[PDB]
Nucleic acid binder design. Structure first.
Ligand SMILES: [Zn+2]
Ligand SMILES: [Zn+2]
Ligand SMILES: [Zn+2]
Ligand SMILES: [Zn+2]
Lengths: 522, 519
DNA sequence: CGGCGACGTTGGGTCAACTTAAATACGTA
DNA sequence: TACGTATTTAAGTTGACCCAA
RNA sequence: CCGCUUCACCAAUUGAGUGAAGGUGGGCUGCUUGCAUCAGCCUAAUGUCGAGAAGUGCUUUCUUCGGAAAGUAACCCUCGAAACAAAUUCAUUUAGACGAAUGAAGGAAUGCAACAGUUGACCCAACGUCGCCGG
DNA sequence: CCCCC
């Protein structure tokens, strides 16, 4: 009945108190008054918003070239004054050292507690374990070690949920996988705090149109003798019941207030307005690093969120279908309505070929290229393009999914059937393996279209894919001549029926056969 | 160490049982012949010559005779009733799967119990003596009492001792490598040194016979319901010996196509039987390639000493410029080319010409009042940095070329002469980069990097290369440069020899010929 | 530049699982 | 006793491949 | 210059061809992302280096199968290093110039389109060396 | 056993 999501927000700064933030806001307003009175007709770069409240000038500038906006920025002498004046305040050096230490010890506890679970279940408990015995062993092992290190209960139960997400019991009993280990460096901090029924969850306050989140935390004390092999470990984290000290964080919604739908009811901005209202409680929080934005890393925060379904006036008596192809990207059909949709944008397949070709050039003769300073340094140009290509892929798939969903909602289509495609991964074909496997995300496309349709109350039926491209959509003749080897050697032609003389596209015919409700779901 | 992987098509029973099986395939072929007096017309790929009366050919795979020549399960079942010692591919597939799952279980649980005893209950203070104590007191004894072979026990103990990396696990650079019990190999250590030749491998008609000593495998009197895969017992080696003989083939699929003979392992197996190359490690594992996942493949690991050759002056190499790549290397009697790629040069030049086109456009109005001198400040430095880039690129190319000639064991490289190198319309330079290249610095750094490694240079300077073929000295004069430009730079096709190869490589071959004297 | 066998790094496909719920110490109103 | 927030705890097996080029 | 875009042409979509115009033809920051534009900047960047010693390797010593110590630094060894703006401080030549730091706290666009994210497992592919076989 | 080059 509810659909789970995450919101990704950027941490502006740690929020501190109400008196220290009153001092910060008044120092910003004092600098604004100082620059608003010292620039007495000396400058004329008042920004369009700054003309209204107080300025006496003519022209409008881009808000980057304002001088009263520029003066509101606080320097480092004010923050060493505030660290001296309020020594119980919370600033970024403590916070970034805590967050990096949390990340590294959460990865270490994840590894050691999965190995300890494998011991207690399979070596000590002789393999005898149900699923509820895995629930007991998770809360008895992973929570207990994580709460023996971090005396938070939020981090310890978040690490229990992170180990629970990746511990598969019968796959490790039947030896169908290896035991999971982390090698990652940006491992999240998983941070559950319960939200059902009589609980609220993490206590998001909205002070002056801001996104303040509060993290229940202990009183950190710097280690006396810091270890020289592991110098990131320099805090102690007392118990949250003995001596609490909750880290509040301000989260970046200033850019999102300029976005086109913030005064709407459906986007990511309406979800953030609802979380700001006190609707849409969150029970899950992940803190990760972003990219190194000017030699100091950005920290992002993911708010898991449970969202209802939207009405849209959409009924399951109208049935649609989607044919996932590599030549033609995505073609949507309706069962009886003579309506049709066909993607025509830039393609993810051509983009994957281009990125693979460039990656082949850059890897092609590495031995003297940038040698001598490690594996990470050596493969630096490719990874910078891998982040950008993953972002471009994801945004292209999401734009295709919104075009598909806008088509299907415009025709009031309630059930979209799709192909099963659970057997494609097992294919022994050399061509598929070497030329089509890693460059054609059919299932990531399918999952994002299931997600986008599921947000609107549209059901998705995985429909068995046998003889779908060759059966005719008018009179279901099952043209057996229209095999894949004939679709190959005829250079992938239109569909021609043998007893109807029916002529439509090969990707639209299989879209209108996928749309048929008679086929058995799988 | 070299690991040579073979297939297993079937076990080798004995002389008499394999005689009965081969006579049964011949008798089924004879009965399928005499019941079909030209009913169907498949005729096999070549059985048409020996004994068939049928019209057209088939690929041997859609024939009628082979699907009768493929035996039936019940025949092997009545043979297993009639012969108690004959081993077949269903029973030994069960034994291989159960031994794979057992050894993977012992390996996984021994790594996790090592990690527990060392890093969790033992607070991270544990030398390798505690690892050797755990192995020889717990894991070797467990593997020597579950399956009583000392080969699989001392192979599992060695695979865990080598695969448990204490120095990399103490500092948490890595985690534990745990497997999937289909990718796990069954180790089977025996000695290499002197007395033990190792597993007593013999030969067949383009096949091999490996005689692993093993046990008797009485079936369990009551299968354990909660572990249903463990259905054998593995009685001891010295009490009831029953050595498995397997039949090993070199055939592999050409990416799921027909069987090609792999001669790269086959030569090494010939060196095994001839008396040298004593083997010491026979792993059994499932196949990893496509259309081989249900095939049991047998890796012979064999140890060779790290012995260099040096360079020998009989091998003669050559460097010549190309038209799509700046430098092509070649050896006369081998294939062995090494074409230096263009893309980093091309993209450096693309960015340098973009910076030139920009700094010569936004100087006419901005840089003004002081003359052209104000304009000239930026370019002098960009081209200086470009020359330093070209110098580092030429040093990288010299490193690549010298690594190529050391790996391919070349002792004397013959380069074209300097003025004959630069006066060339068949170069990548003078077509794209109009003149801007240090040929003298390039040749001096290639000469110095090669003379660092004890390789001579010769300066042969041919009269007319880039159209003379190598296999015959034809002087194919139809290679005009103006012909090459209009025909989109085509390959080298010999007229009388029909030798199809690259136009860069045969031109790199005519420099490497020793029949033309130094100049 | 093609195969074949190891080891190593990476990228990048599918797929699975998480984003729970009841009870209780410790403290306060 | 009502409420809040941080803390802890929930239990027991049961393969899989289907082939002698 | 373009293995850059568009238009016109020729030969048979490749030319890494002819002509005219235009443009980083590679990136960074602009407050979650993508594309285009805009302001500023870097660019030898598919580059060149710094510091180290946990590991692979290598040398020496030791009961020396195992393994440990010390060192060397080849490594697809570890960590890093270009790129918006206001502010602050110092040195040096004659208000200006250079070197140059300490750093986060909403100082930074416009338009269109979006905005579940993380962890792990399995598999395939590319590449690097290391050996064998063939034309 | 087809869905996809
Ligand atoms: Zn302003
Ligand atoms: Zn029809
Ligand atoms: Zn025959
Ligand atoms: Zn010839």
């Amino acid at each position: 009945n509810t659909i789970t999501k995450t919101l990704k927000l950027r941490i502006v700064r740690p929020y501190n108190s109400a008196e220290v933030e009153k001092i910060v806001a008044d120092e910003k307003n004092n600098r604004e008054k100082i620059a608003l009175e010292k620039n007495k007709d000396k400058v004329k770069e008042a920004c369009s918003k700054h003309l209204k409240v107080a300025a006496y000038c003519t022209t409008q500038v881009e808000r980057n070239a304002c001088l009263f906006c520029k003066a509101r920025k606080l320097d480092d002498k004010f923050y060493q004054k505030l660290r001296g004046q309020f020594p119980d305040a919370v600033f970024w050096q403590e916070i970034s050292e805590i967050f990096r230490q949390l990340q590294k010890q959460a990865a270490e506890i994840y590894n050691q507690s999965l190995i300890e679970l494998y011991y207690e279940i399979f070596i000590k408990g002789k393999g005898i374990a149900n699923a509820s015995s895995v629930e007991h062993y998770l809360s008895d092992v992973c929570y207990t070690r994580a709460a023996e290190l971090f005396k938070n209960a939020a981090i310890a139960s978040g690490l229990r949920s992170k180990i629970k997400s990746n511990f598969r019991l019968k796959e490790l009993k039947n030896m169908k996988s290896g035991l999971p280990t982390t090698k990652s460096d940006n491992f999240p901090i998983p941070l559950v705090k319960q939200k059902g029924g009589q609980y609220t969850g993490f206590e998001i306050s909205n002070h002056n149109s801001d996104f303040i989140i509060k993290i229940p935390f202990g009183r950190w004390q710097v280690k006396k003798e810091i270890d020289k092999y592991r110098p990131w470990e320099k805090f102690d984290f007392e118990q949250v019941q003995k001596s609490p000290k909750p880290i509040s964080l301000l989260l970046s919604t200033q850019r999102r207030k300029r976005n086109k739908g913030w005064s709407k009811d459906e986007g990511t901005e309406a979800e953030i307005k609802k979380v700001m209202n006190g609707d849409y409680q969150t029970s899950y929080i992940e803190v990760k690093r972003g990219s190194k934005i000017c030699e100091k890393s950005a920290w992002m925060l993911n708010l898991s969120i449970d969202v209802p379904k939207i009405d849209k006036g959409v009924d399951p008596s109208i049935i649609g279908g989607i044919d996932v192809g590599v030549k033609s990207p995505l073609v949507c059909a309706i069962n009886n309505a003579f309506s049709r949709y066909s993607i025509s944008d830039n393609d993810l397949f051509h983009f994957n070929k281009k990125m693979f070709a460039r990656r082949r050039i850059l890897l092609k003769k590495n031995r003297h290229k940038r040698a001598g300073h490690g594996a990470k340094n050596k493969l630096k140009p490719i990874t910078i393009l891998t982040e950008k290509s993953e972002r471009f892929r994801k945004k292209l798939i999401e734009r295709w999914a919104c075009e598909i969903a806008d088509f299907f909602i415009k025709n009031k289509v309630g059930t979209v059937q799709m192909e099963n495609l659970e057997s494609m991964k097992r294919k022994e074909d050399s061509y598929f393996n070497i030329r089509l496997r890693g460059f054609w995300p059919y299932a990531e496309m399918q999952n994002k279209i299931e997600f986008k349709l599921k947000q609107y109350g549209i059901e998705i039926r995985k429909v068995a894919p046998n003889n779908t491209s060759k059966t005719c959509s008018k009179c279901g003749h099952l043209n057996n001549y229209f095999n894949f080897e004939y679709r190959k050697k005829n250079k992938f032609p239109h569909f021609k029926c043998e007893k109807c003389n029916f002529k439509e596209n090969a990707d639209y015919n299989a879209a209108l056969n996928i749309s048929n409700p008679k086929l058995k779901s799988t």
